[PDB]
Amino acid sequence: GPVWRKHYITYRINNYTPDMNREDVDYAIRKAFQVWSNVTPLKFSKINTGMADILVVFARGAHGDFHAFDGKGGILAHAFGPGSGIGGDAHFDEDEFWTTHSGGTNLFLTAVHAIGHSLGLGHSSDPKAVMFPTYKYVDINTFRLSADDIRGIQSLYG
Ligand SMILES: [Ca+2]
Numbered sequence: 538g539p540v541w542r543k544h545y546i547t548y549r550i551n552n553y554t555p556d557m558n559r560e561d562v563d564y565a566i567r568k569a570f571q572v573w574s575n576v577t578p579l580k581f582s583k584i585n586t587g588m589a590d591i592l593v594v595f596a597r598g599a600h601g602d603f604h605a606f607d608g609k610g611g612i613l614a615h616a617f618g619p620g621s622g623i624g625g626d627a628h629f630d631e632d633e634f635w636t637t638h639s640g641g642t643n644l645f646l647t648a649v650h651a652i653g654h655s656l657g658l659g660h661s662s663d664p665k666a667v668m669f670p671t672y673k674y675v676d677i678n679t680f681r682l683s684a685d686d687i688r689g690i691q692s693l694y695g
Pocket residue numbers: 589590591592620621622623624625626
């Protein structure tokens with residue numbers, strides 16, 4: 538389905554979770570975009586004003602779409618495929634406790650998955666894939682895209 542038809546993509550962090558230090562939110566999101574720029578021709582840039590392609594939002598409960606969040610647990614985040622307006626945007630449930638580590642829900646790992654959707658990927662049935670729909674903590678020692686994820690993204694880009 539839909540893909541970005543340009544190589545320079547922008548993102549903006551709409552608001553910041555109080556669960557984390559501001560700089561750690563910025564870094565987690567930046568690093569998550571890097572995972573995907575490493576395996577595609579895409580370039581990602583953070584902007585702080587105006588309309589970005591991919592808006593990163595922390596929100597809880599009903600927050601303006603059909604994908605209302607459900608309090609702590611269950612659904613952690615959701616994202617829209619490429620397109621105008623809400624297309625591309627990535628939403629993170631503030632009722633989770635976001636972190637840089639194994640405690641709570643790791644923001645970086647969740648953002649890698651969400652951004653996969655923001656770039657046009659669907660879910661994988663392979664539990665080893667980052668696009669599998671259940672969160673799995675892995676350290677940034679073992680984390681890597683799986684073959685399934687790589688094939689998926691290169692079938693869309695590059
Ligand atoms: Ca958008």
